[PDB]
Amino acid sequence: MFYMEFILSLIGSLLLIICVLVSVAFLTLLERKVLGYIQIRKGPNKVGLMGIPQPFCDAIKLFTKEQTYPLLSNYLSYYISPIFSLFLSLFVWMCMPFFVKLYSFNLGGLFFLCCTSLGVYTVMVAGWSSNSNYALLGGLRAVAQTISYEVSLALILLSFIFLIGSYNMIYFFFYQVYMWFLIILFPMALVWVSISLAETNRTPFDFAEGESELVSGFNVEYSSGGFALIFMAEYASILFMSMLFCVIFLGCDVFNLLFYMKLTFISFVFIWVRGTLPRFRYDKLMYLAWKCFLSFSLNYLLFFIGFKILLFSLL
Amino acid sequence: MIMILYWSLPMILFILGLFCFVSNRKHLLSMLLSLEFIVLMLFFMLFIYLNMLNYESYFSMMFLTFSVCEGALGLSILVSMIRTHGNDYFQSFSIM
Amino acid sequence: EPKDIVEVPKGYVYVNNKELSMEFADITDRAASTMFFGELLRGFAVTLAHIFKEPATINYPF
Amino acid sequence: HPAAHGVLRLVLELDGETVMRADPHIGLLHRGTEKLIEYKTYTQALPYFDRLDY
Amino acid sequence: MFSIIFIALLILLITTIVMFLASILSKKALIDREKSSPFECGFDPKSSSRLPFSLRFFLITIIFLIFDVEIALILPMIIIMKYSNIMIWTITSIIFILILLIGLYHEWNQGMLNWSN
Amino acid sequence: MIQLMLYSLIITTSIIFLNMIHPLALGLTLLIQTIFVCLLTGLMTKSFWYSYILFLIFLGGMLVLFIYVTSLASNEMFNLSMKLTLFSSLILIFMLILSFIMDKTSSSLFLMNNDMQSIINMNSYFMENSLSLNKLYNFPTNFITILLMNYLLITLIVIVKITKLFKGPIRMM
Amino acid sequence: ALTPFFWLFEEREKMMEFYERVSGARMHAAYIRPGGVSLDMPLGLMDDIYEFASKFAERLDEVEDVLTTNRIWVQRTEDIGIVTAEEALNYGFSGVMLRGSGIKWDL
Amino acid sequence: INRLTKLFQMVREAGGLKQAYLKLYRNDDLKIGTLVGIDKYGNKYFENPYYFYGRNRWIEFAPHVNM
Amino acid sequence: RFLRYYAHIWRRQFRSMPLWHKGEKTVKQPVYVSDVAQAIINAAKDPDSAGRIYQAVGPKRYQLSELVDWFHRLMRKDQKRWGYMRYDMRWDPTFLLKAKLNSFICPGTPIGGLHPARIEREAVTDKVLTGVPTLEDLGVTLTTMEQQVPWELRPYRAALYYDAELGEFETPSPPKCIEARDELRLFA
Amino acid sequence: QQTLPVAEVAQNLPKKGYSPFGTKQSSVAEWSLARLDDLLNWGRKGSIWPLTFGLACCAVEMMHIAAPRYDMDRYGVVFRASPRQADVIIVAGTLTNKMAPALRKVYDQMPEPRWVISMGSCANGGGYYHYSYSVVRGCDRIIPVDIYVPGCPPTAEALMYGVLQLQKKVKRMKTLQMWYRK
Ligand SMILES: COC1=C(OC)C(=O)C(C/C=C(\C)CC/C=C(\C)CC/C=C(\C)CC/C=C(\C)CC/C=C(\C)CC/C=C(/C)CC/C=C(\C)CC/C=C(\C)CCC=C(C)C)=C(C)C1=O
Ligand code: SF4
């Protein structure tokens, strides 16, 4: 009865947690193979059998390796920031729509907006806590990212929301039963991927890491334990944001198998782009968000305010 | 009393907000930090009263809009502070 | 084709010499790519194409 | 730093991210090549030039 | 909510256990005065990271606070479209988005969106 | 029940907040409290719509002041206060003890949750936030929203004029 | 950008077989000498030099497609590091730095 | 489209899935080639022009080594 | 395991320092390790030094209370701000439990060098015999603690993230050695 | 030099087995540690992360090991920038005096267990500039070295062979099995 109900909710979260945690390990392998094939390389192929156990073969090393205690760092902050980076990455999954109920989440769309914003503090605190010049530049390079994508992100979500009528993610299924919103929203799909990259701090928007501009960005002063969680928390973001693209533009048939064939493909796209584009320039992004994306997104609210109004009169 | 069982806690929190807004901290930002602390508590009470009404919580948005502007304006004045004094310390201002 | 800003002598090649046309037929063509990620599109076709090649790796030491 | 090619030491004067002054500290790869050449026959000195502009 | 809080705590405990395993599973060696020194490309650092870091997007930084608080007023739109008067809802919404665009284009034309130079 | 424990934590975090000196210590204290107040407000309401909004609004303000803290008050100090840790921990457990032995039907707030409403209330069967946010965009209160718009846009003109971007960056000279 | 590094260093690997095949070292051939080169080319090298050259145009086109017209690539390079012609001469500049700014000079 | 027919063949000279797996586990690849010769120490040398130049000639190490 | 055994987190109790008798009945003659190593080698180069006993002690004698105060001044861990304070180890039994627990739990090596065997080393006062040769007989020139310790504890300093201006931390006062006569009175 | 076994003699030798400790442990506790010691070594062996030092003209041949022809990444070797996450350092080039304090520090910042590879003659023994007035005569003067890869520059395969030697050296560590005896 009701007492039993919440037990199942625990199982689902734990089941979803271990499954996501496992997948991000295998995603990292997939990233190396695919990125190893776009480049004419072969990719990890020796370890174990045909390279499949590679990511596990790395999780051993990052945990048998010593913690680093930076001399000039506020140790408690430096030590805790990895936890909340991983926690916020996993926690945002509880809003992922299931028809076999996991959590109701009316206003689920907002819950996305709150959680994704939090992911910046963990980078921000980690960089400042490390107390290294590069780490601080990485942190403040990450914050400036939020100032850019944050506002445009909400508006673009609002456009999708107008189509469905509510902030509950479940309704995306019903409206994408005949077709896919990709057709109606092609430029937004293309724009949305672009902002999605900023969310997860990937090439061409890789500024928090800032590899080859900063030595390793805000991660420059992390090691075995802390660095691992920072890494996993990174790829959990990709996996979710890839899924959130599949529920919005690609049917949202969560109970069908193909939905998971789609989910991996969008994950491939994220790796695919990393092997194509050079990194933007730190300012060109912020100009891009405010000069083009923000103006672009507002323009279609009118287009969808008119379209919904026009459609309302007929129906 | 009703006011003690339901409205005491937010008020006690509010006055603690003010006592932050007046205590002696070197940096002007310490005032801004405590500024939106108080606003957070004002929202809490205002949200108690608005919910005594069945459907009037929409006014929360009205309050939040003025909350950010005073913070946003409060932050602008700090910027103008820097580019005349060079620093925001309270003890750097002429005591008058 | 647009013209060259600087006339070219013999035995020399210029890299950025052609000017930009201002005919609507061309501005729209530039605009369309600038507006639908057209330049990046062919960049993505090329990289994906390399998935379908034999990688040049050697199975050292065998 | 990876972009420095393991030799360069730019002592930048950063006003935020913008650079106001750059001091290219050089000599991290000074191997007194031109003094060794003074001790070597012409043929023995030919390999030294493979190393310059490697 | 109360379900979510419980799982929020349960996850936080789980992730916390992960480093508490890492901190013990980690190889332990004597810490050196140089091992814990900061990383700044192998040369000692001139400047603490806690010096004042100049800012150039300060103006955008403030504008970001504003533009969000208008996101609080567009989000409710959808929820109240079936229930509101269409003229009032239509008129007000438009003159909400035109006001935003006009504000943006005004500053863009004034060059405030550009960074300090 | 957790409402009382939320009362204890918001009190506890407020006591320490009075004693913070380092700006980031203030910020961390404030950020933690913004979570609780956001959580607490949704308990006594028909929906958490406003907690989402409030949380989102303040997080915008949280980032910006770090950017200025990291530029103005970058070099400052912390001091663990054994008086403070004991005092908060002492009262915190003390307060938590009461919440277990409290007549927590009496401590619950009389504000009507969505379930607290009757079954006959026909207006409670619509969308979660339809009616409440409704007259924000209907005659005559809509003009208030319009008034904000100018107020916000006119604000946007105030910051650029106070700021005077062209006369340089900001440094803690 | 990463792929151009690998798409080109694959051709670079083929090219340093010709160094290895005439001199015996993939790098630092020590082949050119004051009296002329130190050995004749191996029999049949020139056929393989042709074979590499015949295919090298395609390799450079693919990198060009991904880089030259890329919108991001232009922004990361355009108007960054301008060298006016009169500045360059005074500086002892040479090579592409000299011809980058329009001077028609090639030793 | 028809690599399976090659794949089944690789198994047959391998000696069934059991010996095929150990081959894959050891050499990290399954390749068809003609035994050119056998050295004094048991290493078997294969060749197949089908593959491109670098991978054209390969060696099987003696079984007793095993890693 | 001497300048770290007193700077470690385990040795403290949240800011404190349980010392036997507050360390005021313990007198020590610590010697810099390099001087000891020099003694070993010098004894190796010489055959005259064979078959004899040598005592390797520093140049000065300090009360254990006096030393630990000086470290925490060097480490910027002064009582005024940091909150350092000295128990008497006999008063608190919690500390002895920590060692007993610490020894048992750790399989490889005690953490913070803390274990009951190490405690007894601290309590016992150095007893340099008269008439046994010292390293000065071997030609070693002993380094004083004031020369070396202030550089040993630089990486253990508290609030090391500060970037202090010059003069914002005042140079600590040196420790006061214990005169030979004073040791008679100190021990009654 | 110990020559390899003849085929007929080798035709009798038993299969080597994976672990270099064999399965001949007397007790359960020893045997479990031995197997558990393999698990560590299998981990560290698999993913060896160089630091991207790249000092001098060995550095170029340290790029071609990552090039598609040889593909260091096939072996789990992944280049990294920060010395904190880096596990191995490949000192490839001429370590001059001006650099020497910088290498020492960068090596120190690397967390244990850290292995060093010396590439080319320059980093091995000073190489072609052995007698120069501003060259450290081999990096082993400054940091411990675990593998020496000769060459000038070492061929790409030569370095690959060096890396595999480091995997085998890692594979046979006795970090746990020696704790038991300790
Ligand atoms: C040379 O030029 C070049 C450069 O210039 C320098 C480059 O920078 C680069 C840069 C390359 C990149 C940026 C590539 C992307 C790679 C990175 C950013 C980092 C490298 C690391 C990886 C790819 C590995 C990915 C994985 C991780 C880092 C760890 C993540 C955490 C994981 C996998 C753990 C998951 C958790 C789980 C519970 C999974 C299931 C269980 C386990 C792991 C348990 C394991 C074992 C046990 C518990 C033992 C139990 C035993 C018993 C009971 C007996 C290249 C390619 C280059 O060519
Ligand atoms: S060893 Fe040879 S190839 Fe390597 S850096 Fe020195 S001169 Fe160059």
Residue numbers in the entry:
A (entry chain H): 1 to 315
B (entry chain K): 1 to 96
C (entry chain I): 32 to 93
D (entry chain D): 93 to 146
E (entry chain A): 1 to 117
F (entry chain J): 1 to 173
G (entry chain D): 201 to 307
H (entry chain q): 7 to 73
Quote the study that presented this structure, word for word.
Respiratory complex I powers ATP synthesis by oxidative phosphorylation, exploiting the energy from NADH oxidation by ubiquinone to drive protons across an energy-transducing membrane. Here, we isolate complex I from Drosophila and determine its structure, revealing a 43-subunit assembly with high structural homology to its 45-subunit mammalian counterpart, including a hitherto unknown homologue to subunit NDUFA3. Cryo-EM particle classification identified three distinct states in our preparation of Drosophila complex I, which we refer to as Dm1, Dm2, and Dm3.
Our cryo-EM analyses revealed the major class of enzyme particle (Dm1) in the active resting state, with all the characteristics of the mammalian active state enzyme. The Dm1 class is the dominant class, containing ~60% of the particles, whereas the two minor classes, Dm2 and Dm3, each contain ~20%. In the Dm1 state of Drosophila complex I, these features are all unambiguously in the active state. First, ND6-TMH3 is clearly α-helical, it does not contain the π-bulge that is characteristic of the deactive state, and ND1-TMH4 is clearly in the ‘bent’ conformation of the active state (with Tyr149 pointing toward the E-channel), not the straight conformation of the deactive state (with Tyr149 pointing away from the E-channel). Second, the densities for the NDUFS2-β1−β2 loop that carries the His97 ligand to bound ubiquinone, the ND3-TMH1−2 loop that carries Cys41 (the biochemical marker of the mammalian active/deactive states), and the ND1-TMH5−6 loop, are all well-defined in the Dm1 density map and their conformations match the mammalian active-state conformations (they are not disordered as in the deactive state). Importantly, as expected from the ordered states of the loop structures that form the ubiquinone-binding site, the site is sealed and closed from the matrix as in the mammalian active state, not open to the matrix as in the deactive state. Indeed, density for Q9 is observed within the site, although the Q9 is only partially inserted, with its ubiquinone-headgroup in the central section of the channel, rather than ligated to the two proton-donor ligands NDUFS2-His97 and NDUFS2-Tyr146 as required for its reduction. Contacts between the NDUFS4 N-terminal ‘tether’ and subunits NDUFA5 and NDUFA10 of 182 and 427 Å2, respectively, further stabilise the interface and, by extension, the relative disposition of the hydrophilic and membrane domains in the Drosophila Dm1 active state. In Dm1, the tail of a phosphatidylcholine molecule is intercalated into the structure, sterically obstructing the rotation of bulky residues on ND6-TMH3 around the helical axis to form the π-bulge.
